[PDB]
Symmetry: D2
Subunit: 352 residues, 4 copies
């Protein structure tokens, strides 16, 4: 049918398509709430993943099941489901290795608006419904639930990769929606001091809400010097990268103490090389582990985060600053992500 | 000096001993606040660690440094410090393996009221001050800080041993002071649903405060049946044992799902064998990992738990139900632990 | 078709069933070489997993694909394959948790001769062929290859569970075919000293071949005292249980040092409880981790063990002491596992 | 007391100092066998660790204890010992975090020929003898034992950091003495295929001896293309960096599959930045972990590696290509490392 799609490199618009058909194990979902992402901007305007032709955008959606294949057992038409941004193929060798995000190739667990039609349409296709859908409790509002498919699972993954010990000091570089969930994720991993690096006031306020004990604004000086002064030269036990340019990797290495971990969940769109400073990395021997992973998807990941919201461990509704209602307003919410206003964190479009 | 001591098996009383002298790396501390433990009850009236003669009891104390050895660098007379219940020798082979709790032998990190005069005296000896003391911030009151040396580090260790994934369902068997900190620890590891098992109303109330979402009373029926009904037959991702008799190990194995973890921090004082049910343990193949560890000690452990309290990640003051004043009430608080009233969780003696 | 089956508890015999039909993702395999297992003895004559009716026995087989479903992509009729004893359903919640051995329930990844007709028949059914089959290189003979499905993956799993550090001292309690692979697995994890506990000379000879540095005969005296004398009172860093009765769990705990690991891969067929000694387990606080897991299965596991054999890291051929030829000798080889002669390690029936 | 020392940047020569005196916990050792290292060449002629003045060189030594402090308990005059290159202070906060290599600061566990007179003297000082010395069994020759302090512990550390699963494919970039021990280390962790990258025939021969299944010579083409062709486009499960310049980091990321690990133990002496390719690192999301650590030291590490040699798990004598006799030949063996002949791997000077 109609869908907000990438017409060509650098240009987008509504196009004409056929309604997707479900396989024996798949399901067709109609969206109830959707959200745009900064990653979709990188695909369109920077060409970071190559050239696409008439591909629907969007990968964050909470919808209602309308049709299932003959083999779907746990979902029926009428069920209220959370759809993860990553819907991998669960029958490959990379799944047996424990990295479903790369099932079938690097980043191949991320299908929506990458190698597969996204969620910005009246219907979309979800492969392996029993493995890639989670029921949505009535107690969770749509605006909060639509932060789970991507923002919550990415930010929490950064905290998971960070290997946070109880009471450790954690720095979160960047407090966009992913970084704000990284701040909340560190609090969920038992972090004591959480130092957040950001400038936008609407984000700084939300960072304190999610557990940040210190805010480092670049208006006071270089980030490295500020954090080293805050930690009295000790540094941080772990740094979570959730924003910035390639140089932020150098900053993370400089502020993490020997034996610590740099956990990256930032999608670097430009630059050939990510710099690792030789001297500050101990010339290769400082035991500063560097991790960088795509957000996990699938049913279990969604079910675990739904319980965190259900039992009031984290409230993602603070991420939602703008709410829209039309299918035509999907374009408007997208435009907000193109040129970030200072009062926007994450916009949500309620469809039905 | 004076000290409340274990005279023989079944008898305690105040005695007179010589004030301990510090070695070049040691410190002499006078207590500012102390707390009795159920373990000392087991030592005196059950002979759980054998017979002692004129051994000062107690291993939970916040104190003021009065004297240090010539080689102590980070602590001077007058410093208010949190003293860990475990003060191990940091120069053994077990420390290089990462198990300071067993530095020099099984449970050898536990010295106070075991192989060394405890803290229930006008002064006590702390070996290796720079490695086994942590500075106490003025912002933390004495009643809350004296929960850190033993209760918090033990309860949090149960949560650490449990290998909790984000959103996992955790059962805490026993909600005494250690179990209440296991509940708080489970919340500090991103647990979603936390099922606490206990009956005493003062403990049930504190368990809800520290994050318990469900309360299971053993007076209403078998714990296994209740928890399986709550989890709709799925079981729990992890069970933390913090109380009960030897049979509670069988209960933990039965409620943990295949691949889960049983983390024990309960001190079993009676029974020759802890039963592991064959069928419910998968006849040996259910991947139900069983862990059991003594609480971590040392400076770094105390500093990180102090940071957790300082940055308001947990408030252990709700563990304290009775506060008395002065040395003479150490006896009153000790006997309070033997005859457990239904309103007692943890008593504190302020030595101002 | 014909099949050697368990009629009821205590009864075995040849039966007749319908040749299995493959689903779209399944494959029908005819066996080229099979081996009986001690686990089937426990299932039939001890009723360790309950009563079965006309369940064809056997779960260790190398076969030839004769039929595949329409969706099988990597295997065709005529391919010679190694079939893992564990062939789990790869589309479950337990797979997303990382425990395919319990996909769909405790031990539910083990289907052959458990909840599904085994391999001791003219044909057998393999669910999810592309995920549960591995190609057999021509360089590996059938007698050696049939040690991979069960013996090698189980024994190596014991070493994996043991958390062996480079140079650590490992004890292997029991040197049947599984224990001998635990010896080889421990060598493959960088173990230094490997202490093997067994009495049968044919097993003692194979233990030395696979890397055992010391032999402890339990008929020669108490295991604990002998091992404690060998390690000069230190104990072992890890103990792998691969045989014995329920009492061997107490033996393992007594010989492992504080902080070490007890890794069980032994299938306990009798007894209600596996005893854990309270005092030797530190009264619950010795950090002696107890693990017990079913062997991993699936394509990737088989492929990696095949690579270990291909690149000559392990030669499982020395496990095979008896080779017979023909379907009728499946009964003879099965009975050989029942009345264990002193010269038997593992028998193989060639159906070529 | 004489010692071969670094006079200034670019100059070396023999000096005279006063024989060092041990503190109460230290020991004075006279060397029985020493070996020069490439790190000392970089220190003297490239100033890789800054400018030093009149510092005795050398950090690889087997020696005889001649004097101990009053508090040394496990070592007496006359004991033959293996001295780790890293002799950290075991009483710091970084030790309680589990990183003794950085006890007191980044790389602060490395004292010999860094902040302390090295082992190229008639005597040298060992701090904390009971924690930093290991008894040398008479069964291990000096030439083999002197490979343990540095080469073996470094190379094996690369294999440990690599997170090798049983049967995994491992690439070792660089086959100098450290890389050759990384190959042996990969074999110890259960690697199947081991791909070694090198050109010198004496190293290629030793690489096959230690377990390499494939050799990649740059004379046949680019390393990235050769390795991807060998693995049929799959890549390797882990890459161990043990040589080369900063550009080798980019090669490692390119050949490791998503979810794998890059383990670096190479000492990068020049360059401001270590390049990480953005696209081949999944734009930050490929789950390609990068680790880089200094070699472990201390008594326990040495004792476990001694056991590996004692029980014949690894023979490091293949690393020794040149053997000299007498103190005066320390200069000759040192200069041998500066202008490496194609037949040199590691030289050893036998003393006494
Ligand atoms: N791994 C995954 O699965 C995944 C999932 C979702 C998104 N992503 C991508 O990863 C990144 C997450 O960012 P986001 O979604 O939270 O929105 P975002 O607005 O792009 O986050 C960027 C944050 O980093 C700050 N920043 C910019 N330059 C910086 C610099 N040199 N140093 C320090 N901070 C700097 C920004 O500050 P100000 O804006 O206040 O000026 C902002 O706080 C995005 O690129 C996103 O597309 C990845
Ligand atoms: N690992 C360490 O380093 C360490 C440190 C300190 C203490 N410990 C020991 O760990 C244990 C923790 O006890 P505590 O200090 O927290 O005080 P506690 O009051 O003795 O804790 C006992 C808890 O277990 C419950 N309980 C008793 N029987 C039960 C049963 N059949 N089923 C379910 N629950 C049952 C009790 O419920 P109700 O009382 O509400 O009825 C209570 O909640 C103690 O034995 C202590 O000596 C260990
Ligand atoms: N986890 C899994 O997936 C899996 C897979 C396959 C098999 N298994 C099971 O694991 C167990 C391994 O047995 P197996 O197949 O290798 O053949 P097995 O011959 O039955 O192994 C028994 C071993 O234990 C020894 N033993 C008997 N009593 C002992 C005692 N008190 N103390 C110490 N050792 C004692 C035996 O010594 P001697 O015979 O020399 O006297 C023998 O070495 C079996 O029960 C098997 O069913 C499990
Ligand atoms: N982390 C620690 O504690 C520790 C301990 C000891 C040493 N190290 C350092 O780790 C490094 C290991 O070197 P080493 O001691 O084993 O002696 P080495 O001779 O310097 O090892 C260099 C090896 O790497 C090869 N090589 C050179 N350039 C290469 C490239 N672009 N790509 C792949 N291979 C290349 C060399 O072959 P060709 O030159 O013949 O082409 C040679 O085989 C040294 O720098 C050493 O200082 C670190
Ligand atoms: K690290
Ligand atoms: K487990
Ligand atoms: K352990
Ligand atoms: K990884
Ligand atoms: Zn996104
Ligand atoms: Zn206590
Ligand atoms: Zn079997
Ligand atoms: Zn060196």
């Amino acid at each position: 049918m109609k869908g907000f799609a990438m017409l060509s490199i650098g240009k987008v618009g509504w196009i004409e398509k056929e309604k997707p058909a479900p396989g024996p194990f798949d399901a067709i979902v109609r969206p109830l709430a959707v959200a745009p992402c900064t990653s979709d901007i990188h695909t369109v305007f920077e060409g970071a993943i190559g050239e696409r032709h008439n591909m629907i955008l969007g990968h964050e959606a909470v919808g209602e099941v309308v049709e299932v294949g003959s083999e779907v057992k746990d979902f029926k038409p009428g069920d209220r489901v959370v759809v993860p941004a990553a819907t991998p193929d669960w029958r490959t060798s990379e799944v047996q290795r424990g990295y479903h995000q790369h099932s079938g190739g690097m980043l191949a667990g991320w299908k929506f608006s990458n190698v597969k039609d996204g969620v910005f349409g009246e219907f979309f296709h979800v492969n392996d419904a029993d493995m890639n859908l989670a029921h949505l409790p009535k107690e969770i509002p749509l605006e909060a639930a639509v932060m789970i498919p991507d923002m919550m699972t990415t930010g929490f993954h950064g905290a998971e990769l960070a290997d946070i010990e109880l009471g450790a000091t954690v720095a979160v570089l960047g407090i966009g929606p992913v970084g704000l969930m990284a701040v909340a994720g560190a609090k969920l991993r038992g972090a004591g001091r959480i130092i957040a690096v950001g400038s936008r006031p609407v984000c700084v306020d939300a960072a304190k809400y999610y557990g940040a004990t210190d805010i480092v604004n670049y208006k006071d000086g270089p980030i490295e010097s500020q954090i080293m002064n805050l930690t009295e030269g000790k540094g941080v036990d772990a740094a979570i990268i959730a924003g910035g340019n390639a140089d932020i990797m150098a900053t993370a290495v400089k502020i993490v103490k020997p034996g610590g971990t740099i956990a990256n969940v930032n999608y670097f769109g430009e630059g050939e090389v990510l710099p690792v400073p030789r001297l500050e990395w101990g010339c290769g021997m400082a035991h500063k582990t560097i991790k960088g992973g795509l957000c996990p998807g699938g049913r279990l990941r969604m079910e675990r985060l739904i319980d965190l919201v259900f039992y009031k461990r984290v409230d993602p509704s603070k991420l939602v600053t703008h709410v829209f209602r039309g299918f035509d307003n999907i374009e408007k919410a997208f435009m907000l992500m193109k040129d970030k206003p200072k009062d926007l964190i994450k916009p949500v479009v309620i469809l039905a």
